[PDB]
Amino acid sequence: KQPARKQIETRPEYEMEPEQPGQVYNLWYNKWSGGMRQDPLKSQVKSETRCVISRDSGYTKADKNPGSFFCLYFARGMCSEGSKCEYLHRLPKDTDFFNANVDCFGREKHADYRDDMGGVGSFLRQNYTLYVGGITPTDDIEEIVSRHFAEWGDIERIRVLNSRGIAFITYLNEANAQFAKEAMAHQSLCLNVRWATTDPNPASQARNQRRLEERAANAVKKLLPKQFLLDLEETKNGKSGNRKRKLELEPSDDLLYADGANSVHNQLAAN
Amino acid sequence: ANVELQTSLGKILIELYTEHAPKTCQNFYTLAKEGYYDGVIFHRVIPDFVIQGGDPTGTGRGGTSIYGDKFDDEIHSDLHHTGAGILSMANAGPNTNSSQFFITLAPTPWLDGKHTIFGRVVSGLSVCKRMGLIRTDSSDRPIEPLKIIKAVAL
Amino acid sequence: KAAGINIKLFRRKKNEMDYNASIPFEKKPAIGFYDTSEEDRQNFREKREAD
Amino acid sequence: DVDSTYIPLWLKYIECEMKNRNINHARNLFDRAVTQLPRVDKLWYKYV
Amino acid sequence: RVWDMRTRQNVHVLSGHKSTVASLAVQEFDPQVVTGSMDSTIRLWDLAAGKTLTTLTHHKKTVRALS
Amino acid sequence: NLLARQFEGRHSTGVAKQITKQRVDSHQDLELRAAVMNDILDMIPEGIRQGKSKTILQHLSEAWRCWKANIPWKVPGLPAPIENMILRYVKSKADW
Amino acid sequence: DVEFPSICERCLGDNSYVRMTKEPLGQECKICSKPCTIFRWIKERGQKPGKTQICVGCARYKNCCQSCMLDLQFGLPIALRDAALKLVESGPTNDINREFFAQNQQRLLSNGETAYDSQEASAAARNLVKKVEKRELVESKQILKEARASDASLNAGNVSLSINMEPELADYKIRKHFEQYGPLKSVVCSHRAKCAFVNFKTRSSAEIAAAASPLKVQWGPEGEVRNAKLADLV
Amino acid sequence: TKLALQKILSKQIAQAVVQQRDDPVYIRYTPSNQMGQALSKQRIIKMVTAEQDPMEPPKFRHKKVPRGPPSPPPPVLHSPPRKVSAQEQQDWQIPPS
Amino acid sequence: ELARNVPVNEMVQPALGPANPFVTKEQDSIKNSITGYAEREYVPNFVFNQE
Amino acid sequence: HRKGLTYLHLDYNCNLKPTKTLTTKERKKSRFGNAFHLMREILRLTKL
Ligand SMILES: [Zn+2]
Ligand SMILES: [Zn+2]
């Protein structure tokens, strides 16, 4: 409840030449080319900076705007403008929905969902769990990852592989999930954080898809007509035949549980 | 009072309720006698609600009775839409009945108001049940023309 | 897989139609006078279950 | 689509529909076949 | 193929046959282009839209002459 | 054109290729083979097991080689219409 | 006449008068991968301009908003909609098949027949909420002591457990349960193991939480599930 | 036919000169009860065609797509097939080369 | 593009039907695009800008 | 660049010289056309 503070006083400048003899900068694709491809998963250099909400979050100029996005750099912890910044420096909360196209972290979501599951999810599929990989020190991997992940958001499921350093924390919301993905990359618990793949478990897929229907039901029940909503519980918490006579006085679901002009309910009152 | 309707899907037979509503049935009877219902499209077909038709224009509007523009509807208590096949009239106001009519496909108890009931389909109900499955575009209108080849009254 | 597996997944080439995500060209039989209706949906259980 | 005049392919399709108990599909297929090739009697004979 | 004389442009590509178009005929009234091919099928074309109107399959072998 | 090919691709499909004095013979061969297939498909009556084009083309090629080498090329079982058509096309090729 | 793009009024701003630009063929549809025109407008002062993300062939096959990717009838993400409602079969996820399906589907949709009617959608929604509410409502003895004593020695028809005071359901439910029993440090759980172990700042808070005792417990993967099968014979 | 072919020809010919056509277009727009809510007031929206950079190369690649299925074939309508007999079947039997 | 100029009093233009009740609120509205009805209007710039 | 030919050096006098020995693949890929070379030489004259 205090103004947000700047993390990095300096600006990290770009000057670096890999493989001193055999690399040359490429002007079109702004990256060094030539030389040994080198392990695809070797460049990963542990991140230097790290952030926590407690000592860093606070007010910023973006809190005023209702549709403002979070700092791409607060989560990774090099937002060097502090409260002057144009993005929120606080943590996503439960009701921080954004549009489907836009990434909840301020970026944009493509459709191909990549191949190495690297940067940003796809709007075509709705997943809240992300692969985190890296160190496999001892059996206390479960507790260390729980400690290092719960402070980024609300958690629904954690599954950690004992044999190898693989964990699959599942978040409740897209906002917290993607914030954690961008906040736990190249950090110390370097972590190889990626997006999760479709479950091959016939049992896990069923419960995930059931979760999808319950999220849909929570979304839609605010839109269905009031009569349908109330009758849903009147049938389950009261007798049924006592009102069919009133219905028989004036009997299908689509005919009766329907809105729009010239419907029976509008016609019944106007008679 | 009895009228056959030679429709594309099949054969439709209607017995008129002359004893209940005489004025609104004589026009239909003599109208089949004149028989300009030839080549008239059932412009409106709604799954489980109605099959409306009877306008020479075919645009869902028009239709001239023997009186010429409209007339008065007569309704009394014992008439109900309790079944699927009651042959009733189409109107657009208090007393605005025209030459066009419709056939009921499901109990419409709410509709026993401003609509005149003057028929029951004794034979050919299967034809109406099939008409309920006709390809229909976005509006309540069949894509192919569901013309009435002939309407012979007997 | 016999003793302890990493669940080795097969390696597709980056240039494939994949021939498994959907029908390669997805052409449906033309609809005729008689309704299929149940003949397929009556046994969607079987569309997956014979498989 | 490649060639609709090949009678063996028509018969093969019909026969594979009889294998899997799809009788309504097969009868629609006969209707299409006989309305496409009215002057070949193999299709008519199989239909009757 | 339909070519504008002046600009050498292929405005229409009347592609409906399955084999070589062995015959041709053009007139001013619709049908404007009539093509008979190896398929034994004669196609009557709508030159304004570049789409076929009527297909004539009475022939058994390739139709080599239109007049 | 260079920038378009850089930012667009070859667009190689759907382009024609003129005959340039090196493809003349190999294209004349295609046209003659297509013409002979057409004539074969025509002179054979209905329901006479049309699967005979390749063998007749082989016969035509052998007739051409025999003419080039001045050999009679007289075949026992060949039907008269096929033999006549082959002679006709061989004479065309020889005059060319 | 290539007049207007289908955009919902939630992301068209709360101003009845907006100004927007169009550049033909300026982008490729993110589903069709077909050329499409962009429409850029300002939702409200103090916000980066929005823009359409998909062609008009899409947002017609999907009944969606070209900008915010929300369906125009239920206002919920299109992915969640097609996953839950399952109204009509979707397209593939690979490039060539999806573009072929989209192009031919756009053709047959322009042929005149609408691929989306809302009657079936409302019916499917009511069915979905109905299904959700309905969803709301000697060999055992040897698999009992096979390793229950063993692990205890290493590092520690009916059976009745014991209660000591020595000093489907997600984990956040556990988190918002133990806040009155003290501050939380970490809660490590597993659905298959059915065991949730919690940590507090002080042992006194944990012990007073344990004192609340008179479904609850007080103090490969299969190795941790041996005692979890006891729930059927607890 | 002249108008149709001329339209197609002009479209073909149009495919180097800098395009100069900028003029606002106003659209009266009517919202329709999307997510319930309370519909919305009628809106008028100003269209302005954003002019393109004369230096822009082609914006994106063009890729080939296999040709779509054709229209269903028409009925054949042949004269009844004739009988050839085994003698004429054999008289067109060609020897191998 | 109505072609016959006609006196006003017959401009009520009734649909003359039993008012199909199966339709929901989405299709009650007439539209070209998926979202709504849009049509041209020749507004001069200054009035649009000031309002 | 944008062609991957980052081993070719276009020095400031507009001479296209490889920075290393090229294999057959690289030599075939790094072959430019008459338009690029003509533009390069016109640029060289302008720079002179
Ligand atoms: Zn910031
Ligand atoms: Zn929107």
Ligand SMILES: [Zn+2]
């Ligand atoms: Zn699209």
